[PDB]
Design a protein around this nucleic acid. Structure first.
Ligand SMILES: [K+]
Ligand SMILES: [Mg+2]
Ligand SMILES: [Mg+2]
Length: 135
RNA sequence: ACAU
DNA sequence: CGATGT
């Protein structure tokens, strides 16, 4: 119904899927960029969306912030809820980095607690998420 | 089908 | 058009 403006919004950007993956988190109210991940040479859109949420969780926890996180990714929200990223991406030498980060993000989820609500950004009603890359 |  | 996901 109503955007919760006091929130963090995250999104992935890619060149190819699979392809080069990056992500960022922004203040939903102002668009201020709060974190950005260095591009990862090969990953999937959903792995990036998943890493972006988990990074958001870690970012907010470190700062003692109870703000919710918005993501537009049904998939990544579910993967975080499950603490398991069910990616189809082949595990080989060229995908090792993204899979290391995904594995480490799962590991963080399995060893830490959080109350952060992870909310679906309703793109159909509200337009593009504020963290979008514009491509 | 829906979400990317 | 192609790909990633539930
Ligand atoms: K984009
Ligand atoms: Mg997205
Ligand atoms: Mg986007």
């Amino acid at each position: 119904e109503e955007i919760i403006w006091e929130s963090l919004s995250v999104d992935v950007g890619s060149q190819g899927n699979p392809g080069i993956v990056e992500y960022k988190g922004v203040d939903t109210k102002t668009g201020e960029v709060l974190f950005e991940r260095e591009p990862i040479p090969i990953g999937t859109n959903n792995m990036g969306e998943f890493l972006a949420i988990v990074h958001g969780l870690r970012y907010l926890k470190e700062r003692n912030s109870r703000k919710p996180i918005y993501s537009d990714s049904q998939t990544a929200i579910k993967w975080v809820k499950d603490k398991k990223a069910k990616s189809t991406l082949v595990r080989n030498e060229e995908t090792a980095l993204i899979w290391k980060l995904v594995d480490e993000a799962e590991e963080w989820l399995n060893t830490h607690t959080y109350e952060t609500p992870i909310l679906k950004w309703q793109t159909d009603k509200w337009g593009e998420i504020k963290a979008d890359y514009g491509r």
